[PDB]
Design a protein around this ligand. Structure first.
Ligand code: COH
Ligand SMILES: [Co+2]
Length: 210
């Protein structure tokens, strides 16, 4: 075999490289602070805004409307998280994207303009499925290590989903039931590996200095 299982087996090597990065290892260990966590959330808002722009364009065309659920949207809740984290709403006009986040947004803007359905589905898998399966863990250690207020952690909470585990199995079945050509499947497969590299490069840029 299936598409959901194939994505979890081929991108398993790249997924191990993301959790073994200097920045993510220090952030989850508790060796950093709420300033380093806030810089990660600031960069995440920049690529999630670009990601959702591409998702909105591909959903409008009819490509995988059931898969692209607008309840998964994180840019609106990430903006509210950064308002509580920074203490003000004035962060919007003073944040600069890192070299990796620029490359990431450029890729998501190309996917939006070309309305590349399969490539968008690969980026949707990489970001949203990881958020649903590891959100509650990252929110727990952010409160334990940095004392982040639970209301400033809405990114890790999906209010539109009552059964979180059931939603993961429904997302994988919708991914498996995507009618795709052999070229569209290989494009989605090669894009899924690319999307993991983009997210790993974001952590590599953040880890510089500390
Ligand atoms: C323990 C460290 C860790 C971290 C920090 C982390 C953060 C990130 C991250 C950050 C940018 C990305 C791109 C991913 C990528 C993913 N992670 Co993780 N993951 C991690 C370990 C896991 C584990 C374990 C799962 C459970 C898989 C499952 O069966 O739900 C997971 C779920 C996923 C899934 C869903 C796959 C599936 O179930 O089919 C993707 C994609 N991810 N992860
Ligand atoms: Co670079």
């Amino acid at each position: 075999a299936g598409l959901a299982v194939e994505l979890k087996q081929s991108t398993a090597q790249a997924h191990e490289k993301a959790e073994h990065s200097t920045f993510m290892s220090d952030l989850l260990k508790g060796r950093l602070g709420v300033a380093e966590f806030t810089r990660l959330q600031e960069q995440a808002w920049l690529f999630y805004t670009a990601l959702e722009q591409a998702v909105d364009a591909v959903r409008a065309s009819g490509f995988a409307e059931s898969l692209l659920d607008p309840a998964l949207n994180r840019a609106e809740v990430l903006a509210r998280d950064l308002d509580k984290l920074n203490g003000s709403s004035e962060w919007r006009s003073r944040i600069t994207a890192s070299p990796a986040v620029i490359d990431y947004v450029n890729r998501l803007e190309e996917i939006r303009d070309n309305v590349d359905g399969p490539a968008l589905v690969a980026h949707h898998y990489v970001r949203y499925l990881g958020d649903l399966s590891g959100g509650q863990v990252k929110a727990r250690m952010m409160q334990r290590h940095y004392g982040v207020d639970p209301e400033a952690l809405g990114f890790y909470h999906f209010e539109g989903i009552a059964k979180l585990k059931v939603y993961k199995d429904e997302y994988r079945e919708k991914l498996n039931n995507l009618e795709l050509s052999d070229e569209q499947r290989e494009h989605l497969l090669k894009e899924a590996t690319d999307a993991f590299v983009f997210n790993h490069q974001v952590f590599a840029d953040l880890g510089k200095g500390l």
